Structure 1
Amino acid sequence: MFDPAEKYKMDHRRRGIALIFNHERFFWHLTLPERRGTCADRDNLTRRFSDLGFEVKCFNDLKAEELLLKIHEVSTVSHADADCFVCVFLSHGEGNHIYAYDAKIEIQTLTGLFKGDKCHSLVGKPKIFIIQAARGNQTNITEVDAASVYTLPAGADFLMCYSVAEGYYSHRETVNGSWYIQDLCEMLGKYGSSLEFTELLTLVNRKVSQRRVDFCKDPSAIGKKQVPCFASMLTKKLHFFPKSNENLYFQ
């Protein structure tokens, strides 16, 4: 009884949690620049993930110890009554690391906490990570960073989403926020509730790839294109259709 149109079960009581780790400033001795505009990203994401039924939980400028505690907490709580799990990083990164305030964390140890083995309540449910992280280079200016974070997959039923691929550049407007987040959040607003999520991420790839970078206020920023990507280990179609909440306890 094999079904080419099989969808993840998205009929649980609650949609699930969306973590957002949001990083604007860094410990002096890391020599990483302010990510001015990351609060636009955090707020835009918070709105769009809320409207899809997520319990959004934001954390600003956590040290490694605090971050590991919050994400481990969330991994060991029960997700039994939840459709899925979303985790977002807005920071600097390098290779297989994201920056917390004070030090780098191995991405594999964060995604590892939600792998079948370690988090039973999320087995066979989609686990989406969205990563807006690049190399800190050193009114509304556009800053540009070199891609730095390996666009790795995680495990079965994960979807890893990346602002930028190897050899491209990642853009953040200091008031409007990151190109990738703006375009992801626009697409979530228009199509979040109708389109399959990889269909949508493909729209985000088109939108971001088509941002022209020929006439730029900085000369050295010209020719630096942005192409995002996603690594899918999903096994079914993923939809965020409106949940029917009429005369039901959903908290």
Structure 2
Amino acid sequence: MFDPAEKYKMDHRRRGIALIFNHERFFWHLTLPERRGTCADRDNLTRRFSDLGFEVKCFNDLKAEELLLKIHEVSTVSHADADCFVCVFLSHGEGNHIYAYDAKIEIQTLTGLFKGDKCHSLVGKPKIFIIQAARGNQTNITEVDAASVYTLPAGADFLMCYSVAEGYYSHRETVNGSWYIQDLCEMLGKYGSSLEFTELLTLVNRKVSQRRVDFCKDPSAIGKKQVPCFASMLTKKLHFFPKSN
């Protein structure tokens, strides 16, 4: 009795964990610029995910070893009584890699820890990764980075969400934060608790795509449009309806 309107079962005791890895500064010998504004992104994401019932765990400027430890820890704890898992990266990236403070890490080995094989308690539950990462460039200025992180899929019941697609540019206001994360957080506030999550991400695609880039204080930043995307491997409608205490 196959159902075209099947929703992920979101009636477990807890919503689940939202990891946020937040990277502002980098080891000198990496020659990567400060990401002034990333704290606004971390704080905005933390508030909006908290209001949808996530236990939000933030980590600032972890070295590779510490990041792998924290994310492995979370992968081997039980999610049996959880709706889903969210993991956010705010850093620089290149290709299949995100930057820790120290060094780059393959995204596939981070997403791999939550695959059915390796994390039984999350099988058939949504695993959502959100990635604001681009190429390290060099009061409220708008900085623009070229897209650099591949828009990779991840496995059954993963949703990979990307600030920017190949050939487009990602924008970060040094006080207000990343265009992508501002618009994501605005949509989570207005609609997080009602709209299907891919419907919401589609709103975010519209909001960010519509941001005008013809009249810029920096001339070289003109016509550098931003288009985000998501790569869905979801098998059901995903909603974050308020949980009944």
Equivalent-residue separation in structure 2 for 1:138 and 1:74 (angstroms): 35
**Cα deviation digits, residues 12-36 of structure 1 (max 9, x gap):** 0000000000000000010000000
Residue aligning to 1:126: 126
Identity fraction in percent: 100
Shift of 1:42: 0.1
Shift of 1:48: 0.1
Q: Give the gaps of 5 or more residues in structure 2.
A: none
Equivalent-residue separation in structure 2 for 1:122 and 1:2 (angstroms): 22
Query: What is the TM-score normalised by the length of structure 1?
Result: 0.97
Aligned to 1:140, what secondary structure does the other structure show? coil
Residue aligning to 1:46: 46
Mapping for residues 182-197 of structure 1, pairs under 5 Å: 182-197=182-197
**Cα deviation digits, residues 107-142 of structure 1 (max 9, x gap):** 000000000000000000000000000001101000
Q: Give aligned pairs, total.
A: 245
Shift of 1:193: 0.2
Equivalent-residue separation in structure 2 for 1:227 and 1:80 (angstroms): 36
Shift of 1:9: 0.2
Aligned to 1:171, what secondary structure does the other structure show? strand
Equivalent-residue separation in structure 2 for 1:137 and 1:228 (angstroms): 19
Shift of 1:185: 0.1
Mapping for residues 53-132 of structure 1, pairs under 5 Å: 53-132=53-132
Aligned to 2:17, what secondary structure does the other structure show? strand
Aligned to 1:48, what secondary structure does the other structure show? helix
Shift of 1:211: 0.2
Equivalent-residue separation in structure 1 for 2:87 and 2:168 (angstroms): 23
Shift of 1:188: 0.2
Aligned to 1:67, what secondary structure does the other structure show? helix
**Cα deviation digits, residues 149-186 of structure 1 (max 9, x gap):** 00000000000000000000000000000000000000
Shift of 1:215: 0.2
Runs (4+) off by over 4 Å: none
Aligned to 1:145, what secondary structure does the other structure show? strand
Shift of 1:78: 0.2
Equivalent-residue separation in structure 1 for 2:198 and 2:29 (angstroms): 39
